[model samples]
Target: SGFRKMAFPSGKVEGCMVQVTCGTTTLNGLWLDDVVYCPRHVICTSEDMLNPNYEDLLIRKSNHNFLVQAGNVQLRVIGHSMQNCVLKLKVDTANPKTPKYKFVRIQPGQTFSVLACYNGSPSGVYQCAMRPNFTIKGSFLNGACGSVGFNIDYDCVSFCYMHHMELPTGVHAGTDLEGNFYGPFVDRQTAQAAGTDTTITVNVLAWLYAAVINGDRWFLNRFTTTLNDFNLVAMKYNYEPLTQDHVDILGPLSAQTGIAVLDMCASLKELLQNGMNGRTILGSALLEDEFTPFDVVRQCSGV
Candidate 1:
């Protein structure tokens, strides 16, 4: 739980707002122990990201609610699902002594919801924002025509604590989370040569910021792959991923192009449907500065 409070609770990052609320709206200082806070970083594989484990969490508070102060400095500034791949079968592992589920391929026009109570009522329900019936029976494009099964999921779970480490792997490049390759990568060469394993807090935010500011489509693609894989693994491991607020903020920031923020999965769908379309444009791989995304299509286009 060392991922305690937000390092910059009152600080704001580019294109994103910072707001954390404590107690009432009277502008009185509330102790850190009074606000509902999601640790800046969840331990590698310690506990379920958003499942309980705090004293500040609202059990039954009055109209005086609590916000992460998403855009305010302790004022009332705050805000903020997904579906893909196999059902993974949301077995009730809460009681270990529980029953499990099925993995039948969901058909188009079928929306399913399973309410879950990890031992209490009103905790939450399985919210599926699936596109084209769970999965479109295809993976990413190999830089051209032929396609395969893909399950790129853009989910909104919690404000922080992205469940990247919980997603599946073995398909996409730069989508692995087993290692802490957590920083802005200027091509595999630089990161490999320098060993950019920045385990510092908020490492992803920093890396994402750099990827966007520098307009590195390669890294942007890297981020997208990470998100998709993260969603898959998060489902596989039952860990909640990033929320909608993070998605909205990550829109113009992480996605250089003007793709809809919530449709991260949709963007990947486009990528699979058409390779080299966006990633191989004028300077998608140009070294105009000191960086470019590690886009596989661009790299192997001449190979």
Candidate 2:
């Protein structure tokens, strides 16, 4: 079975991301073993408890790396009472391939300074996320665990962006294999919004990019028509909208668009924090061609 299917749970099995900020941040999805990590919510095994030594629970490394590009980097892994997991980090690399490694057991709540003192290389608005700061791995000493769809609440810290390092729940930048993005962006280069696909929830970024300020409304109209909830008017253009029939077609369409707009606005309000109309500001900035908000910092290396 594939790595995702090999797991016992049914969540985003390998969804990890490294966000770029002044320094960096990251979200390590998946666990040391074959279980969902960094997912939006916790999960449990579908049956009663976990099986004895479930072979799939064998040790495995996380799918992504944490970008440690600043001072004093530390991460805390959320542990399960029944989970037998291990996190390993190399203490030194004098011998390179044969360096001394440090392995520790992760229980309930514990923090480790894995990427300590990352004197970052100047990236100048580029990303160093492609490179890993250190070598680390996670594994399950005991296999089969969990019970009755036991949700693995791995969102303790998913994308540790930059500054004061910590993981925040995110959908990451790109989409999973199925093209579902749950982040603050929409990969416009590789994306064309769809309404029926509820999984593509965070395309709200496109809405703002299309409208606001002196921006063209066509950009907004094309990305939100695939919404299955409104069930208003059907779509005829990726760059069109309004007029009544104008009211019959335009009224339902605009009303539906309003709901979609509100949905994204409220969500962004919460995601970016309260008391901040981050949604409008981002749209206005886009029109002004101010790309500072979209910039990222990297901790990458020649390695």
Candidate 3:
């Protein structure tokens, strides 16, 4: 205690020394011939993110609340979850006697919620949004097929390999096709005639902003696979691997297409900006001249 103050009956107690608790450690012990005391009850409150120690956070909404599992110190912020709501998550880690808050960053196709408390009273509840993970299963005219999976929380064009499309020998190319082709079709035709499957598995890493803007997840979900069928199963509950093995499988395709990846990404971004006006697009206002893939996707997709 630094100073001693007179205790009165008016429920006022003043002291010179302040007691501090850090985990099992305590400071400001009372000295002989003197008495020291501190408030028994203290309330913790949320503060502005201007504090240097604050952690910046991006908050969004999801279909269901994401609960914090045991041993996990997760934080959630609920508001306009679909839009790009940039916020911050802060704590007074300076005190170790208290349990440390361990938060895992949000993942694609995940969601979370948090209970806001002030002092000892419940304040409100908040939730956060997450991006979706996609599983792409590509099949060729032949019986051979393969699957690829990737997670995207932001705008991105990741290269992938679709199953090879082999044309029979003497087959000629035509003008009309919705497919994005890779390499020459003649080589594939020859390989097909030779009784050997030898067509290049070419795929593009192209992402359209429409899925992110309108919140029309149905549309976003459609891109999840090459199967081209729709259902809650495909839209809501499907998982795939995003490992190096998949990357290794796609490496051959990447080697052939990597050279144009940057150009392709730019073109994709340009396509999103083409018909976009400031007001018509849901989340469009957030799309400034310099925007990220997430920025474009954050706009309401109207789903």
Candidate 4:
């Protein structure tokens, strides 16, 4: 058997391609090395967005282990058949009590299945994550609430629809109780305007420090002072090294807040310690900030 080579120009967009031989006919949709391109930003013809490549990845937590199941991960192809596309799925739950489960060699554009290998060896909730690899590559479109547990099912349907792009082209002004618009918005601005600032990073930090001291007072309980004052101190010490006493003043405050203490850090030590580990809190240190308090009907109304 003999083979022939085909070459293409450096710059050209072929809508589609085909080849006719002595007795055979074949059509090659604009592909690279016979690789299918990711679907263009197309208006979906389906009634709804396709499901995420990995959803309902069955997971279970037992006395000392975990288990996960994966299935039916599909990929969209553009101008070519999805061939030789390989996808890899990785499940990671870094908590010591909850072991992470990951998968390898899971491809896309094909209805394939695999059982993630995490045995029943722990006692915590287990979930799955996925990644697609060679032969096929594209962002996985995740339609979160087609139907699932612990989900905002009704809310999801509307949320996805809001970004569907198939809706009419225009701007509509309607307000909710919060005076927020529920419809699409259009901003009429051209690349005709620009601005320049002469402020230094220290000035910005000082402003943020003031905002933190005033806007978020609760996050700075450990400073033995206030966030604004501390921010000024930070601005002063931005170049100079700090004494241990300066570092120790903030240890108590970060221990109070739960997962919400994500925004405050006037010192380098506290910023590096509590800020990086996603610390819930240590003692009196209010690391995380909480949302406004509101009792759920299920909790109080007893519905």
TM-score of 2: 0.20
Candidate 1, residues 1-303, lDDT tens digits: the string is 111111111111111212222242211111121222121121111232344332223333322343423223333322210012000111111222111211233322222232211111112222221122122111222111110111111221112111111112211211111212112211121112222111111122323344334454443332344455645543432223444444554444345545334344433334334554445422333212111122211222222
Task: Evaluate model 3: give its lDDT.
Answer: 0.22
Each candidate's number of clashing pairs is: 23, 29, 26, 26
Candidate 2: C-alpha lDDT: 0.22
Across residues 66-154, which tens digit of lDDT does each residue of candidate 4 receive?
11211121112222111111111122311122211111222111111111111111111111111111111111122210110011112
Model 3 misplacement above 4 A: 1-106, 130-271, 287-303
Q: How much lDDT does each candidate structure score?
A: 0.25, 0.22, 0.22, 0.21
TM-score of every candidate relative to the true structure: 0.19, 0.20, 0.19, 0.18
Q: In model 2, what lDDT does residue 192 have?
A: 30
Write candidate 2's Cα lDDT for 40-64 as tens digits: 1112132412332323322222212
In candidate 1, what residue range of length 10 has the lowest lDDT sum?
A: 80-89
lDDT against true structure, model 1: 0.25
Cα displacement (angstroms), candidate 4, residue 273, comes to: 6.1
Task: Return the top candidate by lDDT.
Answer: 1
- Candidate 3 residue lDDT tens string, 1-303: 111111111100011112322123222211011211111110111232122121222122131222211113322222211111111112222222222122133322222222222211222322222212111112122212111111222232121221223344422121101122223322122332322221111111212233222232221211222122222222232222223332343343334333232333333233333534434322333222222233222322211
All models, RMSD in angstroms:
21.3, 19.3, 27.4, 22.9
